[PDB]
Design a protein around this ligand. Structure first.
Ligand code: F8D
Ligand code: F8D
Length: 285
């Protein structure tokens, strides 16, 4: 079926939970043996969210190459994403090592450091120009260059230096700051505006390594971001945009990381975002 009318048909019939449970039943199951080794316990935030072995990002280290991060490679859309958990106190150096080694331009953050009164990720970037951060375990230096605070998101320019070679690179930090503590946003307008700002920066383009996107576990909000982006790109590429099947795209992405889209409300919100976005790309919003 088309998307917008499939959407109203699920609303009128109130069957979002059944649709979402079907997706959970059909999703791929691949091994995640490296994630479960005892030496990696303090490298995982949640015991039930792990990268598959076949798609995990490897650090360029011989001691321990493990990080909780996955490469999502979308062949028809010609887009790749790295989805990862929010960094832990003992993985902030690994996180920036990955950004460096994978040649990423941008980092997309979809959570606040504290939500619901609890810590959701480490404070892993510097908050003042004159107070830079040094990660001694991976030999990197990180400096805040500029910060632009807007009503729904903040963009930061960061300098990452490999202290071993003295090479430097500019990284863009795109921080969506207004996702609610509970539930999903009422309107997708600010989330779509944010997606378009990431696109306009070059951070999703083939002349760079894959964007790094995270929330707390790296599957819920993070899944919504890449699912919406890929579906909109396919609608632009194909002769028949109504052929884009958001459930099929989501199942394809779940071949590369488990659990993407965590609730039926996140699934409905993803439909809403693609539907509204497809009107702005052309003229009927
Ligand atoms: C650094 C810079 O000049 N630019 C312009 C665009 C590509 O030329 C990129 O989009 C953004 C957005 C936000 C920030 Cl802080 C920087 C950028 C980049
Ligand atoms: C492409 C798209 O569908 N959308 C949805 C709009 C809000 O409904 C978003 O913000 C922008 C801004 C500029 C452009 Cl070209 C596209 C958009 C987004």
């Amino acid at each position: 079926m088309e998307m917008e009318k499939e959407f109203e048909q699920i609303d009128k019939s109130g069957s979002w939970a059944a649709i979402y449970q079907d997706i959970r039943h059909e999703a791929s199951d691949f091994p995640s043996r490296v994630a479960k080794l005892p030496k990696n316990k303090n490298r995982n935030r949640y015991r039930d969210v792990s990268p598959f072995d076949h798609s995990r990002i490897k650090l360029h280290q011989e001691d321990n190459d493990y990080i909780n991060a996955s490469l999502i490679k979308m062949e028809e859309a010609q887009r790749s994403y790295i989805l990862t958990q929010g960094p832990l106190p003992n993985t902030v150096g690994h996180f920036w090592e990955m950004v460096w080694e994978q040649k990423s331009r941008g980092v997309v953050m979809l959570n606040r450091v504290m939500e619901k009164g609890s810590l959701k990720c480490a404070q892993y970037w510097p908050q003042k120009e004159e107070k830079e951060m040094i990660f001694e375990d991976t030999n990197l230096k990180l400096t805040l260059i500029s910060e632009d605070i807007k009503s729904y998101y903040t963009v930061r320019q960061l300098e990452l230096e490999n202290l071993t070679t003295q090479e430097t690179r500019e990284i863009l930090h795109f921080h969506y700051t207004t996702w609610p503590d509970f539930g999903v946003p009422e309107s997708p307008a600010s989330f779509l505006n944010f997606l378009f700002k990431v696109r306009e920066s070059g951070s999703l383009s083939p002349e760079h390594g894959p964007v790094v996107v995270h929330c707390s576990a790296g599957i819920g909000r993070s899944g919504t971001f890449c699912l919406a982006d890929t579906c909109l790109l396919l609608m632009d590429k194909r002769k028949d945009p109504s052929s884009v099947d958001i459930k099929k795209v989501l199942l394809e992405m779940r071949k590369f990381r488990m659990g993407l889209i965590q609730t039926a409300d996140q699934l409905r919100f993803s439909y809403l975002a693609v539907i509204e976005g497809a009107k702005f790309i052309m003229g009927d919003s």
